[PDB]
């Protein structure tokens, strides 16, 4: 009924519920910066501060997901996460930080991926619950 994997799925679900709004805020900040003197400079810098700041959470939570799904024997789900891990590794290797088109495209793709992994985890958990 529980199997201890429904817990990992619930955790990842509650966490992606925030990741999705985070990516939404990313897309909204991009649409707002699309305007591209001191007023605009500050309006851009205050937001770039938060943006450049909010990097670590993504890596942390993705590591959490991978670890939990490795220890919960949910192998079929880990393979659907490792590509984003390699992507983040290549980003840390070389990340553009010309710089807006690719940024918005990666943001949109990552948002779609998060919102689909939401449903994936939800269905997997629903099936794991009633597998009795």
């Amino acid at each position: 009924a529980f199997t201890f994997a429904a817990f990992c799925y619930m955790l990842s679900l509650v966490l992606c519920a925030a990741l999705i709004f985070f990516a939404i805020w990313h897309i909204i900040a991009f649409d707002e910066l699309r305007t591209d003197a001191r007023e605009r400079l500050r309006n851009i810098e205050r937001i770039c501060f938060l943006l450049r700041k909010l990097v670590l959470p993504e890596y942390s939570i993705h590591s959490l997901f991978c670890i939990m799904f490795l220890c919960a024997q949910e192998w079929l789900t880990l393979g659907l996460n490792v590509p984003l891990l390699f992507y983040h590794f290549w980003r840390y290797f070389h990340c553009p930080a010309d710089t807006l088109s690719y940024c918005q495209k990666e943001a949109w793709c990552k948002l779609a991926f998060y919102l689909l992994s939401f449903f994936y985890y939800l269905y997997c958990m629903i099936y794991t619950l009633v597998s009795s």
Binding site: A1, F2, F4, F7, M10, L11, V14, A17, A18, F21, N43, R46
Partner: protein, 378 residues
């Protein structure tokens, strides 16, 4: 061829899946059937099977003084030999020549197969009523409120004393909860269900019953044993009736009852039942008495002398154990049928945990919006 009288008692003797389309020894099937087959292979004779009229084994009437059943069939020429679960007794040995027991057995105990391991999702609240859980919750939030107030309007002593009283309160609360839970677990742990008859003689919660009338209660009667004497005394003063009608009645009433009733019957039938649907029964207590079933035959006969040898040969070759395995377990509709805490006892805890976490995430998101938007944009 040679007549062979028997009785239709399962699983010793039974009918094929289609008894209307059969004529001959192939009609019936069972342990006793293969037994008689081996007996014939030993003594080398052709035999013809038959059933008893009265559907009984044998006994005397206080007025007729005439044996009935297969016993009478043998004594009165109606049967050449008997092959069935014919209990060996002193009265019957006086009129016929029993062979050595092809199957030893005795009285047994039966109970409901315990699988009641379905815990309530929110069972962890059982140690104490919701009447206290809600008090706990509201006291927590009220104390948080008072602490916030004191630290707000007076930026300490009040904080110190509220912290101390809260420490005292949570101390006593966790202590009470832990102690009640430990009592529950311990009590549930030190319950030796049954291992013998005395386990019941020294208790009265679980009643035990027998058939309305048979060799069982008779054994209980005229029993010097203090344990069986007490059991007979109890059952005789039983209200409602521990004694019941045909086996099926006791079987069903103990099936429905969780653990409040037990049925005393033969060990062999108890084994057969335990290996039959719905596989919700078992036998644990060792056999109390000790008797056996044997092949009967007319006194002045030649087969008994030639039959005891075959019986012993089969008992030594293990063929009898093999046949019993075949007709009790191999033919069993039930293949073969802890201490720590399972997650089910705590599921609700993680549920409410994830609930609080999601609620906190929502609160944080709405606050971040209501702040950043309202300040920078608005």
């Amino acid at each position: 061829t040679v007549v062979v009288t028997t009785i239709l008692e399962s699983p010793y003797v039974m009918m094929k899946k289609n008894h209307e389309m059969l004529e001959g020894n192939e009609r019936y099937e069972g342990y006793c059937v293969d037994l008689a087959a081996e007996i014939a292979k030993h003594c080398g004779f052709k035999y013809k099977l038959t059933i008893v009229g009265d559907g009984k084994y044998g006994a005397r009437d206080a007025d007729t003084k005439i044996w009935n059943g297969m016993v009478g069939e043998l004594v009165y020429g109606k049967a050449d030999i008997a092959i069935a679960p014919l209990t060996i007794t002193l009265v019957r040995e006086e009129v016929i020549d029993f062979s050595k027991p092809f199957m030893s057995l005795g009285i047994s105990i039966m109970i409901k197969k315990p699988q009641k391991s379905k815990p309530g999702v929110f069972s962890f609240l059982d140690p104490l009523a919701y009447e206290i859980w809600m008090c706990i919750v509201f006291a927590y939030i009220g104390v948080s409120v008072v602490l916030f107030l004191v630290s707000r309007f007076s930026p300490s002593l009040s904080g110190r004393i509220v912290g101390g009283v809260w420490w005292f309160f949570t101390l006593i609360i966790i202590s009470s909860y832990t102690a009640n839970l430990a009592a529950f677990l311990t009590v549930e742990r030190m319950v030796s269900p049954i291992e013998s008859a005395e386990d019941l003689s020294k208790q009265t919660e679980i009643a035990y019953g027998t058939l309305d009338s048979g060799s069982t209660k008779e054994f209980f009667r005229r029993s010097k044993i203090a344990v069986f004497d007490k059991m007979w005394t109890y059952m005789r003063s039983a209200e409602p009736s521990v004694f019941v009608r045909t086996t099926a009645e006791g079987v069903a009433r103990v099936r429905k009852s969780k653990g409040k009733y037990a049925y005393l019957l033969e060990s062999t039938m108890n084994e057969y039942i335990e290996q039959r649907k719905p596989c919700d029964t078992m036998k644990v207590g060792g056999n109390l008495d000790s008797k056996g079933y044997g092949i009967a035959t007319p006194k002045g006969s030649s087969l008994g002398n030639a039959v005891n040898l075959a019986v012993l040969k089969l008992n030594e070759q293990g063929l009898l154990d093999k046949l019993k395995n075949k007709w009790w377990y191999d033919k069993g509709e039930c293949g073969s049928g802890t201490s720590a805490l399972s997650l089910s006892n705590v599921a609700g805890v993680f549920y409410i945990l994830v609930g609080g976490l999601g609620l906190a995430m929502l609160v944080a998101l709405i606050e971040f919006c209501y702040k950043s938007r309202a300040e920078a944009k608005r």
